[PDB]
Amino acid sequence: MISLIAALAVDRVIGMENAMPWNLPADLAWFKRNTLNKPVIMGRHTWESIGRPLPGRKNIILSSQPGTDDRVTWVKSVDEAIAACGDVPEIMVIGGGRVYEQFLPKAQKLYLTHIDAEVEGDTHFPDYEPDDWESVFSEFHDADAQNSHSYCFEILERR
Ligand SMILES: NC(=O)c1ccc[n+]([C@@H]2O[C@H](COP(=O)([O-])OP(=O)(O)OC[C@H]3O[C@@H](n4cnc5c(N)ncnc54)[C@H](OP(=O)(O)O)[C@@H]3O)[C@@H](O)[C@H]2O)c1
Ligand SMILES: Nc1nc(=O)c2nc(CNc3ccc(C(=O)N[C@@H](CCC(=O)O)C(=O)O)cc3)cnc2[nH]1
Ligand SMILES: [Mn+2]
Ligand SMILES: [Mn+2]
């Protein structure tokens, strides 16, 4: 199955200047828990934003140009990215905006974090059709001394 995972601020903002404009330790822990031991597909700008390979995961980077780092796998099309994952139960697509748009029609599950933060951004999660999706899990958390915003973890499944 293909799944997307993302953290969204207000108005579906996901990034600004090739970075994320918040620091939510609890959300990165959720990201790690839901991606470890799975392949992760990302676009080249997200690869540069993370800045290093993610441990315990097969890292697959989409770019139209040849690769520049043999610690990760480089592919040149969506279909090649999927194939490079081979025969696993669940493929995690970890962004960014352009990559999420291309994989959304192919996805069966969304792992969304809704963050109560107002930030200017330059990248948005796609504007998906809510009627297509069933919420199967939601868990709200208030802000605390480690996490400066409230946030809600949600899992949706395609109906
Ligand atoms: N909040 C979140 O959960 C989250 C998650 C991930 C990323 N982000 C943010 O998202 C932003 C980056 O997103 P973005 O939309 O600018 O970029 P992106 O989707 O990460 O990367 C786009 C690049 O991927 C390559 N690519 C995409 N589709 C391709 C295809 N079909 N075939 C070949 N190459 C393909 C191209 O690289 P080439 O130009 O080399 O061809 C393209 O320029 C950053 O701000 C980052 O912090 C946020
Ligand atoms: N829910 C969610 N939150 C995010 O912040 C997120 N970020 C990306 C892409 N950017 C990043 C940036 C950093 C790390 C990162 O350093 N992760 C470590 C955290 C380890 C920990 O908290 O102990 C990792 O091992 O996954 C992951 C993805 C994609 N989907 C997301 N999805
Ligand atoms: Mn806030
Ligand atoms: Mn919902």
Domain extent listing, the chain: 1-159
Nearest ligand to residue 128 Cα: 4
Instruction: Please choose from 28, 40, 125 the residue to mutate so as to test ligand 2's pocket, defined by most ligand atoms within 8 A of CB.
Output: 28
Nearest ligand to residue 24 Cα: 2
To one decimal, the resolution in angstroms is: 1.0
Residues lining ion ligand 4 (Cβ < 5 A) are 135
**Fold designation for 1-159:** Dihydrofolate Reductase, subunit A (3.40.430)
Instruction: List, as one string, the DSSP characters of the chain.
Output: -EEEEEEE-GGGEEEBTTB-S---HHHHHHHHHHHTTS-EEEEHHHHHHH-SPPTTS-EEEE-SS--S-TTSEEESSHHHHHHHH-S-S-EEE---HHHHHHHGGG-SEEEEEEE------SEE-----GGGEEEEEEEEE---SS-SS-EEEEEEEE-
